[model samples]
Target chain A: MKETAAAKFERQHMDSSTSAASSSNYCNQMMKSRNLTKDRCKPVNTFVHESLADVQAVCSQKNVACKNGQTNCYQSYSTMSITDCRETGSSKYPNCAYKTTQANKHIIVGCEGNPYVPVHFDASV
Target chain B: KETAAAKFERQHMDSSTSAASSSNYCNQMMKSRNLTKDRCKPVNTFVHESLADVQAVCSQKNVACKNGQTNCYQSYSTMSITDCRETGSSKYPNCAYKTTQANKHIIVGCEGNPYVPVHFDASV
Candidate 1:
């Protein structure tokens, strides 16, 4: 994910002595400890689901345009790539699948994008 | 969560606030009247089992879930809080009711590896 201007500026405001690698190391640790194994010891991934209302909430947060363009803007998983590891390949599992589902105003996020995103998903299937 | 994002365009056309900053008008409303700290309060603690036992002090019984559609089936499902205190300024509005969802498949114990359970009740 591209760093936001505010986030980039915040980094500059911090102690310049801190190496950029420091943050990446922490990110790596989080990726490692976060369970993606899809077993009894499944790890938590940060992908979150949201509804159209939820998309409104998130677009509200990011100040992204959600008007005439797309009512389901929050359904994109690419936006979640920075903070979540849903698609990250795990060492222990190969067939792992992650998905999200939504109905009415309730949006679910996980390995899958938000409920309103374009996808051929059926809960019973 | 709802957005007056449409309102943003109109406000910015003749207004000085960034599309980002104008969104926080909800926080200003909450601060105007201290109905809540900032956003609606949220709590995500899990309640694992239903068996009640001895306790000298009377304990309050909490409703297991908020949405009537969800059944407290597992030892515990999960709950989370959504605080919008700094939301508007943070890019989301606080005045709107917000929601999202996720699902994970679980293995019912004593059903064996890869064995799904049937004790589950039907849901909407």
Candidate 2:
């Protein structure tokens, strides 16, 4: 069976630990370790550096429209720590090079559920 | 970076073709969408229903997520979707997919003020 979206988010975005070493090389280690580099370069990605509970609470913060014009997105009430990963210009397959940068920004995410947990990372604004 | 919602829209919310024109529909689309560049994206779904219909599943039925969360939902209407699987003989850049059309109740996670779908759970 294919992995669920929630599961995918956990693997790709959710890293709720203050103990994890978050350095300048965070994206390089994470993109590869998380299996986002198994195939081609993931191109662009984001990793939320907060607890899952805090991220989930954004679902109730502010409602917004999804990028595709759907009405199922939300913005965080407060800024959160995040790492944005982008493929380096010269990066190639099997050798995915990335430029890692950290930020404290209010993020937008897509949420789903009667319990309203975040399932998709939308943007950092 | 492509937002998660954008990824979902590109990967799952394709309702253009009612049915796979040939056995290669999944094979062709998986490549067209850049999912098979360095490796194949095994086990994926393409919904042949409109975006509105897909989102409306939130109010349709409730199910359980893979993690046993109660936020999951299933669509009431039988939707047209193509299931892509990597055949045993499938190889890089030449991955093949089996084209199938079935009436499935799609499972999705719902959320937000209006309780809309935000995750693609699974199709049953």
| Per-model TM against the reference | 0.18, 0.47
TM-scores of chain A across candidates: 0.21, 0.89
Residue B54 CA displacement from its true place in model 2, Å: 53
Residue B52, candidate 1: how far off, in angstroms? Answer: 17
lDDT of each: 0.26, 0.78
Provide C-alpha RMSD values for all models, in order.
20.9, 19.5
lDDT of 2: 0.78
Evaluated on chain B only, what are the TM-scores of all the candidate structures, in order?
0.18, 0.84
- lDDT of candidate 1? 0.26
In model 2, residue pairs whose N, Cα or C atoms come closer than 3 Å (at least 3 residues apart or on different chains), thus clashing, are A112-B110, A112-B111, A113-B110, A113-B111
**How far is A12's C-alpha from truth in model 2 (Å)?**
1.0
> Which stretches of model 1 miss by more than 4 angstroms?
A1-45, A62-93, A97-125, B1-109, B114-124
Q: Distance from true position, residue B119, model 1, in Å? A: 2.7
